[PDB]
Design a protein around this nucleic acid. Structure first.
Lengths: 834, 94, 850, 61
RNA sequence: CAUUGGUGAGCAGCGAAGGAUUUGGUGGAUUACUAGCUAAUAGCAAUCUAUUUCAAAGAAUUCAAACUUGGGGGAAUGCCUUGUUGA
């Protein structure tokens, strides 16, 4: 209940740097800002490592034995990761800027193109334990004149050649004795050589340069060595080559351009297989399978990922996650989907398990600031700054009606009647709560009475009173249904923002500007208590700041709050660096989560370094933009005081750290906080934790199993619930037979009914037993359903996990059987032909 | 785009907007992004929107809005009266 | 004594021990090697970072060190390591049983000198070779020739001559021949330390009486002599800047500087290293630079510099006295009580018998600082009572730290040895806090704790009283009185609701803290030395005097686990980060690893030096132990984070694999009745049902541009009747013979969804209808097994899209309908989930809504 | 004298809009140039690990 | 009578061979530690020169190139672009 971990980051499928597949076709590794997130294209699951990387990743390599992972900053830090242990092995520092990391094809020893040096290192053994200094450097080769920009290996382990910003391209052999075999330097291009490669026979070397030229080097005559046999030209007009890979067993230069294009070739022939438009923004990285038939592209401007199959001319994914620009959230009534707003306007529908967006919604013109669901997940509402709140369908993907005001007002926030009749929205311009009906797109009423704007709006799910949240320091609770039209204001101390209501329908949790979170009653105007949040908020000092991080008033409040569905915990998050988990009765926070550790983002550090401060100004505020080689980087088009604006170029600041909107999951103790880096997901699906309940000395895991040999089936379930460990429970849940399921399921005590319902809800989704799991849910609902009705709120996370299992996977098996059952009846009974 | 970026997006909306759009019936896995799953299986056009009941082309029949078709020859004169009286008040409402 | 869980990472917090450090020169920069016991270190000299530590521990202590440019020559007991980057690249073994005292390098030769007055010569096997490897010869010195060997020096410009200095006199050996080319005269004093000079032909000498003797070798005479009162000279060095300067390092902690031109001392340094631990063991002017590097035996290493002279015209007479520059610090004494500071395992507090607390860094080893002891001037205005000759705080026996409100007030409470109060410390400012906490009943503080909110500070007196001081103001709030003997551990739960305490009278009292009521009171048998609470799960463990760990649930108020197996007093222990382990260290010189579910030890580590404290990280990665001898902190890497750990009670041997590796794979199927799914992803039904719609949306909008010259057989070109039939139809056909399909359907699981549409559309049936009727009889034989109920019905439905035109027109054939009745006789049984889901739906909709 | 990525050191003058005379100094680009104070002599340094010594009076290296 | 105002005389109290305020300079941190240099599979580090050269490889838009301009109006002379006269 208390220990959460960073389980998943969602959205921003690619940010910067190298994108590599697994040894197989299966696991796709793409960088996010900090973390090497792991996608599984076949066995549809997603996964993101818990380790922070201190700046943005520049490069990634995967061990061909599927075991070691290296991710390296812009500056040159380095981290080893075990895959199958999901954990950090060693933190290494390279003292210069790195450009490409690739292992051997053998897997023994990895190379690093850092600065103008080629560094060749022995990888540490995996099964050997962690030491102080696990890396052993083989050699450092130094023959280059400017920075080395790429790297490749041979197909044997024994040859490595690099490409530089120097025009050269030099072959290095690994062992010193094979130096005499190959030491020559390839040159002759006109601009930056960005790739050089081997064919499947190592006789021929191709080179690829920024200007658009391909050479074919070959050990040929005029005792004779390495002429250019034939030149090939892309003829890119104002496009330039940006990243190129080459699958040598299938002869494919997958080539990306600065004009968003992409070409394919077959290299002794140079026949253009196919040319695509991948976007308006430049292709920043490519890589291939080992088998050569998934490609993987990412433009880093919008931050989109494109996995392309080339033989059948079809995508696997063209996904786009967006950065610094997700305003609000909503979990579905099912646990399985999270809908994020944007600042573009696009409303995406993200999946938790396989972390890609299902659909977009591209009807709004400007940013979207609130999203909520209603009506058991068919509809989804969204208030924009376009001047409208639009309804949506999820069965058909369409607007119902676009609700608008009278005099065209902005809409911040939104509240939907649980019985989906009424949609309420609130502004900054008007401070009048507009109220639309769902059927008739007219506004029913303009509920007014606030000084200052409405921050948030939300409905009871119990009796459907709504409660507004002004900036005249007053909650005002409305009652809008049925001949009453009566109003009750509750004054608070400072400007409130981001209300939320308990699923009881009897309490309202507020987040004022003094930091403090107060909890009011509704049927009375008085408050239960308040919990103090000004101290346990971590605040960043920005780079351009002039005050200490201790006494700035930027971030010490909370711009969101959401009660858990138990009604016992609040998760709060604001423009600060931190997320909180307050307990509601005991009034004490449980654990504080730092959202990100990036120097790249602004609001991270409590204390900046002192060596950055030169007598005139910080050494981060200096424009490095004019130093850059390309034109497109140097053009500063940032508008003067644009904050949280349209594009990320128009800041002329680093992006701020802010957690915009936070919600709990319905099912499984998860909560998602929508960050700058992208939508975070915290969870407890590990359960590597010993949280026992009512242990005697007699209860051991040796004792529960011996109750199963003794056929003592109700005891061995209760003896396994006392440990609250999942592998003892799966030992006894899968053991006991059908004939004593309803005898056991009734005799379960009333204490463990949340545990077994949180178990079967979480276990049956990814487990093969449909028929065995449903006999449990038949037995538990029938034998002890009346206890479930009394404590509805202690089970609403457990039951929702069950009736997601029934809708998502159980009904679709039924409907396919039903489709099988009726198609049989039509064909075998009706008449033939001719 | 430039002026709203200066103004720190807070955008005063356009006053009026009237537009027609044309939707094409597709099985609505084909309206979502490239990803190997889906949430919606049916067609994008609603079943009401691909068949409204309509007045029959023959003069000898009258079809109502619910699907209760009536010929002109199986009516009684008192049922002829009410239907002309019913189509009186709906036509006069416009 | 090999453990299965832990493995040592390195020892944190040691700099030197007394063995003379030796400097090496790279280009224009300087590196200092030191040693720590059996594992030497390397420091840069430009900023004193840690650059290299050795890869393995040596089998004994390193006795002497020297370093020529890249290669560090380390000399433990019988052998000499020739190390590069801390890696042992060549081990050189000396053929005696004597232990090597001193070592020297010049030219092609290595010169190692054992303790029994014998000198070994090792030659470079080739002038290309970098480390000398071949045994050249054995030089001996009989006691009629000279005394015991003080040192080995090689002076400048002597072809293979080796200046062997002894306690009596000075020798010279031509190591090519092996002959004594010159012997000096006998000295009236016992020589202690020799060092060469930047002038020609002169070695400097140091006696046990305070006399430095310059000694020429070409004249064989004493050129200059310098008398020192009452000092045992331990180190000598010459400044090579161009100004003549001698640095004499005593063994009474003094460093003394001379000016040989002016024949005067310049400035004498007092107590730069401790007299008791050895004084200045080695001091060295770096070459051509005004930097002397002093490293005593008291686990420090300091650099001192000479500022330029203030006089314009005079210069060499008015000399600035030396100046403190950077240094590194460790504990001189072994650490008494440590703790971890934060969650990311980034600082460790360590308080030792040196009386000085240190915030060591696991992360970067130049980040470690002594927490200051400089009392805040009082709010009240009256002056602070203390001795004016400032002495350090008495040594620290109990520490508590909660990190929740750091940087705003104090968050570290320490209890000093034999003081009726117990001070506080700020973590961020690295300083003693402004508040001191008294016990108000004149008892000694034996145990402290803090609230998780960081507002309350618990103090457990040795007379029962538990005073709870607040942490803003240091004000008194509540005083609890349950115990009568010494309280030896307090804690507060995670919720700030319930509070425990443990006494030496055996009472384990359970308090409420919101209300001030005593919830309950539990009495065990033995007196109770210490308590470690675990706030995540409300389990806490006690250490008794009947040598057993008792673990007590904090909610249900009863002993849950009791752990037997120790045989002497349990020093300290800690829970795992997840409550799954307890690691306890005791005076039986063991470190065990208890396992709370199964109630037994799973790993027993016999360490020869007894471990005083064991502390896990809050993260699940590091384990830190502090021993009785030695100064630093041994850090253990956790294999459990990278490997599953068996849970067997193996300890009794030295001194259900479901359960042993604590993981459980599911059944494939419980019983033959139960329907199942396919193992793996749940999208395999959906992609098989919707493969045509997915591919119609996956494609690009427009056609990609092709060239006209394309290889027609491009897919086949990838550079590296019944026999012509595919493997599926052939395995169907052989399956059609034996009327069985169990090996067939194992293939249909392992096809790709891309393959299955290409496969079932290829069933070759127009007139005879063999292959359809064989394929239906595969699916009916599938559902009789009840495995993979999802997929086989989708293989059924995929027929009716591909061949539903065909089997409809050839309905009422007796061969097809024989299969289809055999389908429907099988397919009727699996309505029993459709009658099961609707009950599972309609109840759960009725229960949660209504 | 400008220097380009061609390697063509180009003499210029504010009256004529064409270069006065082009000079293929080195292969690749031109890292720097310098001209003797007398005006006779030029020295170019291309990025092809090369270096030329030109005579600007007669345009012969 | 009240000071939540300024100055300045005293006392209780706190009080180990002194106390308080203010400030110059240097060092160690302020992200996670695999050494310096060069012509770099090696050499130096007292230095690369009386081996530092030859050989090899190396020349696309047959001469693409302001994605970069505050807004109106003009541009004689320039320049650009096209057309043309003449050799």
């Amino acid at each position: 209940k208390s220990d959460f971990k960073f389980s998943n980051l969602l959205g921003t499928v690619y940010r910067q740097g190298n994108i590599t597949f697994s040894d197989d076709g299966k696991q796709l590794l793409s960088p996010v800002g900090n973390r090497v997130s792991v996608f599984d294209l076949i066995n549809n699951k997603s996964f993101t490592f818990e380790y922070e990387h201190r700046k943005n990743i520049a490069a990634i390599d995967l061990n061909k034995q599927g075991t070691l992972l290296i991710s390296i900053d812009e500056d040159g830090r380095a981290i080893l990761v075990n895959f199958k242990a999901r954990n950090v092995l060693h933190h290494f520092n390279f003292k210069e800027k790195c450009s490409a990391v690739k292992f051997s094809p053998d897997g023994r020893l990895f190379a690093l193109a850092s600065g103008r040096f080629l560094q060749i290192w022995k990888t540490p053994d995996v099964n050997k334990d962690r030491q102080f200094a696990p890396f052993v450097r083989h050699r450092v080769h130094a023959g280059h004149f400017q920075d080395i920009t790429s790297l490749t290996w041979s197909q044997d382990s024994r040859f490595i050649l690099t490409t530089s910003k120097d025009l050269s391209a030099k072959i290095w052999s690994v062992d010193s004795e094979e130096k005499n075999l190959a030491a020559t330097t390839f040159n002759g291009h006109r601009d930056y050589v960005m790739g050089a490669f081997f064919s499947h026979d190592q006789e021929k070397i191709y080179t690829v340069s920024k200007d658009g030229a391909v050479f074919v080097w070959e050990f040929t005559k005029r005792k004779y060595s390495w002429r250019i046999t034939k030149k090939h030209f892309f003829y890119a007009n104002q496009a330039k080559v940006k990243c190129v890979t080459f699958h040598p067993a299938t002869r494919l230069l997958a080539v990306g351009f600065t004009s968003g294009e992409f070409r394919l070739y077959d290299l002794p022939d140079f026949t253009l297989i196919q040319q695509l438009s991948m976007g308006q923004n430049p292709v920043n990285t490519v890589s291939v399978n080992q088998t050569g038939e998934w490609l993987a592209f990412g433009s880093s401007k919008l931050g989109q990922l494109l996995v392309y199959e080339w033989q059948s001319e079809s995508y696997i994914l063209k996904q786009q996650g967006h950065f610094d620009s997700t305003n609000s959230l909503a979990y579905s009534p099912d646990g399985s989907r999270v809908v994020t707003a944007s600042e573009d306007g696009k409303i995406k529908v993200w999946d938790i398990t396989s972390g890609f967006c299902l659909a977009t919604f591209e009807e709004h013109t400007s940013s979207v600031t609130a999203v909520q669901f209603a009506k058991r997940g068919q509809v989804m509402f969204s208030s924009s700054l376009d001047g409208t709140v639009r309804a949506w369908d999820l069965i058909r993907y369409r607007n119902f009606r676009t609700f608008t005001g009278t005099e065209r007002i902005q809409f911040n926030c939104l509240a939907v009647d649980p019985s989906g009749e009424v949609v309420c929205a609130g502004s900054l311009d008007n401070f009048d709560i507009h109220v639309w009906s769902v059927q008739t797109g007219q506004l029913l009423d303009a509920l007014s009475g606030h000084e200052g704007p409405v921050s948030c709006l939300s409905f009871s799910q119990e009796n459907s009173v709504l409660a507004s949240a002004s900036w005249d320091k007053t909650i005002r609770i409305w009652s809008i249904f049925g001949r009453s039209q009566q109003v009750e204001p509750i004054e608070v101390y400072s400007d409130v923002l981001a209300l939320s209501m308990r699923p009881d329908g009897k309490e309202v949790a507020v987040s004022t500007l003094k930091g403090q979170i107060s909890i009011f009653n509704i049927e009375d105007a008085k408050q239960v208590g308040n919990i103090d949040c000004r101290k346990d908020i971590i605040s960043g000092r920005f780079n351009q700041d002039r005050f200490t991080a201790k006494n700035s008033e930027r971030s010490k409040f909370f711009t969101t709050i959401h009660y858990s569905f138990d009604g016992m915990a609040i998760v709060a998050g604001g423009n600060n660096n931190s997320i909180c988990l307050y307990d509601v009765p005991n009034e004490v926070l449980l654990k504080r989560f730092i959202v990100s550790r990036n120097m790249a983002l602004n609001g991270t550090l409590e204390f900046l370094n002192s060596k950055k401060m030169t007598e005139a100004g910080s050494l981060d505020l200096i424009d490095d933009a004019g130093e850059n080689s390309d034109l497109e980087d140097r053009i500063d088009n940032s508008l003067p005081g644009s904050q949280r604006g349209g594009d990320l170029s128009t800041r002329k600041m680093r992006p701020e750290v802010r957690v915009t909107s936070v919600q709990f999951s319905p099912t499984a103790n998860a909560f998602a906080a929508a960050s700058t880096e992208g939508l975070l997901i915290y969870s407890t699906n590990d359960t590597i934790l010993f949280d026992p309940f009512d242990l005697d000395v007699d209860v051991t895991p040796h004792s529960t199993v011996e109750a199963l040999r003794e056929k003592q089936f109700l005891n061995a379930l209760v003896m396994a619930f006392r440990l609250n460990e999942e592998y003892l429970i799966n030992k006894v849940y899968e053991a006991i037979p059908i004939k004593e399921i309803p005898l056991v399921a009734s005799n379960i005590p009333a204490i463990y009914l949340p545990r077994i319902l949180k178990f079967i809800g979480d276990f049956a989704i990814e487990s093969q037993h449909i028929e065995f799991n449903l006999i449990w849910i038949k037995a538990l609902l029938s034998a002890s359903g009346g206890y479930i009705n009394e404590h509805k709120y202690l089970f609403s996370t457990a039951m929702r996990s069950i009736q997601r299992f029934i809708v998502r996977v159980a009904k679709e098996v039924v409907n396919t059987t039903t489709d099988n059952k009726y198609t049989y009846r039509f064909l075998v009974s009706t008449d033939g032909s001719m | 785009y430039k002026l709203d970026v200066l103004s720190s997006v807070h955008f005063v909306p356009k006053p009026a907007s009237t537009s027609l759009e044309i939707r094409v019936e597709t099985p609505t896995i084909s309206m979502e992004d490239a990803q190997p799953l889906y949430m919606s299986n049916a067609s994008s056009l609603a079943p009401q929107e691909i068949y409204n009941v309509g007045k029959a082309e023959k003069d000898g029949e009258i079809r109502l809005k619910n699907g209760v078709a009536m010929s002109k020859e199986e009516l009684t004169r008192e049922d002829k009266n009410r239907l002309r009286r019913a189509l009186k008040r709906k036509r006069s409402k416009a | 004594k090999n453990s299965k869980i832990f493995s040592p990472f390195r020892i944190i917090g040691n700099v030197s021990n007394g063995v003379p450090f030796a400097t090496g020169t790279l280009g224009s920069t300087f590196y200092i090697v030191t040693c720590v016991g059996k594992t030497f270190q390397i420091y840069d000299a430009n900023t004193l970072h840690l650059l290299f530590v050795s890869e393995k521990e040596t089998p004994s202590s390193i006795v002497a060190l020297s370093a020529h440019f890249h290669y560090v020559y380390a000399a433990y007991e019988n052998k000499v390591g020739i190390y590069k980057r801390g890696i042992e690249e060549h081990l050189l073994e000396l053929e005696t049983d004597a232990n090597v005292e001193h070592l020297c390098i010049f030219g092609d030769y290595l010169c190692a000198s054992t303790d029994d007055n014998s000198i070994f010569i090792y030659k470079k096997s080739d002038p290309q070779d970098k480390y000398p490897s071949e045994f050249y010869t054995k030089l001996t010195v009989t006691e009629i020739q000279g005394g015991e060997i003080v040192s080995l020096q090689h002076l400048a410009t002597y072809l293979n001559k080796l200046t062997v200095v002894t306690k009596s006199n000075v020798l010279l050996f031509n190591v090519r021949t092996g002959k004594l080319v010159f012997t000096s005269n006998e000295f009236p004093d016992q020589i202690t330390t020799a060092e060469p000079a930047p002038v020609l032909d002169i070695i400097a000498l140091g006696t046990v009486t305070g006399e430095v003797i310059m000694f020429n070798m070409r004249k064989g005479k004493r050129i200059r002599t310098i008398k020192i009162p009452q000092s045992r000279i331990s180190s000598l060095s010459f400044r090579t800047d161009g100004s003549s300067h001698l640095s004499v390092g005593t063994s009474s902690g003094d460093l003394i500087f001379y000016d040989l031109d002016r024949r005067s001392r310049i400035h004498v340094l007092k107590n730069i290293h401790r007299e008791s631990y050895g004084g200045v063991t080695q001091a060295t002017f770096l070459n051509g630079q005004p930097i002397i590097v002093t490293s005593g035996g008291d686990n420090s290493l300091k650099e001192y510099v000479f500022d330029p002279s203030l006089s314009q015209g005079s210069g060499d007479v008015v000399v600035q006295p030396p100046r403190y520059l950077r240094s590194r610090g460790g504990h001189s004494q072994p650490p008494s009580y440590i703790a971890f500071a934060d969650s990311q395992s980034h600082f460790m507090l360590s308080a030792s018998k040196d009386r000085s607390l240190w915030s060591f860094s696991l992360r970067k080893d130049a980040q470690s600082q002594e927490m200051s002891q400089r009392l805040h001037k009082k709010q009240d205005g009256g002056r602070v009572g203390g001795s004016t000759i400032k002495s350090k705080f008495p040594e620290i026996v109990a520490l508590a730290i909660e990190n929740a409100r750091i940087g705003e007030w104090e968050n570290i409470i320490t209890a000093h040895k034999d003081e009726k109060f117990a001070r506080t410390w700020d973590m961020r400012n690295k300083r003693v806090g402004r508040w001191t906490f008294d016990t108000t009943d004149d008892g000694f503080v034996k145990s402290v704790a803090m609230s998780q909110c960081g507002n309350f500070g618990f103090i457990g007196s040795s007379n029962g009283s538990i005073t709870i001081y607040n942490m803003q103001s240091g004000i008194l709030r509540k005083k609890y009185k349950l115990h009568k003997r010494a309280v030896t551990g307090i804690s507060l739960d995670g919720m700030n609701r319930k509070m425990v305490s443990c006494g030496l009278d055996g009472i384990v009292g359970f308090y409420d803290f919101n209300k001030s009521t005593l919830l309950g009171k539990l009495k065990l048998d033995a007196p109770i030395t210490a308590m470690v609470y675990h706030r995540s799960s409300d389990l806490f463990a006690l250490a008794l005097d009947d040598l057993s760990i008792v673990v007590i649930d904090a909610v249900t108020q009863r002993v849950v686990r009791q752990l037997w197996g120790h045989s002497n007093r349990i020093t300290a222990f800690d829970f795992s980060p997840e409550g799954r382990w307890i690691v306890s260290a005791s005076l039986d010189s063991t470190i065990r690893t208890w396992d709370l579910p199964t109630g037994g030890c799973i790993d027993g580590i016999i360490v020869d030096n007894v471990a005083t404290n064991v502390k896990f990280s809050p993260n699940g990665d590091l384990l830190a132990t502090t021993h009785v001898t030695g100064n630093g902190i041994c850090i253990w890497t956790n294999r459990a984070q990278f490997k599953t750990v068996s849970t067997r009670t193996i300890d009794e041997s030295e001194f259900l694999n479901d359960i042993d590796f604590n993981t459980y794979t599911s059944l494939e199927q419980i019983d033959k009745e139960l329907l199942t799914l396919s193992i793996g992803p749940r999208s395999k039904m959906n992609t098989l049902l919707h493969l045509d719609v997915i591919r119609k949306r996956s494609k690009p909008k427009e056609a990609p541009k092709k060239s006209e010259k394309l290889p027609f057989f491009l897919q086949l070109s990838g550079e590296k009747r019944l026999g012509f039939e595919s493997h599926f139809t052939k395995q169907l056909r052989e399956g059609s013979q034996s009327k069985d399909y169990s090996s067939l359907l194992a293939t249909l699981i392992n096809f790709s969804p891309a393959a299955v549409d290409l496969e079932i559309r290829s069933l070759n049936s127009f007139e005879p209808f063999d292959e359809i009727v064989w394929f239906i009889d595969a699916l009916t034989q599938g559902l009789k097994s009840n495995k993979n109920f999802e997929l086989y019905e989708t293989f059924m439905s995929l027929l009716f899209k591909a061949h539903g035109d065909v089997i409809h027109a050839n309905n009422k054939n007796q061969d097809i309908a024989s299969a289809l009745q055999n389908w429907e006789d099988v397919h009727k049984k699996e309505d029993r989930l459709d009658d099961l889901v609707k009950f599972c739906m309609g109840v759960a909709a009725f229960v949660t809504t209504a | 004298h400008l220097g380009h990525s061609n390697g063509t050191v180009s003499l210029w003058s504010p009256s004529m809009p064409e270069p006065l005379v082009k000079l293929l100094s080195a292969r690749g680009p031109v890292n720097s140039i310098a001209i003797d104070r007398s005006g006779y002599y030029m020295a170019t340094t291309g990025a092809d690990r090369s270096m030329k010594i030109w005579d600007i009076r007669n345009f012969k290296q």
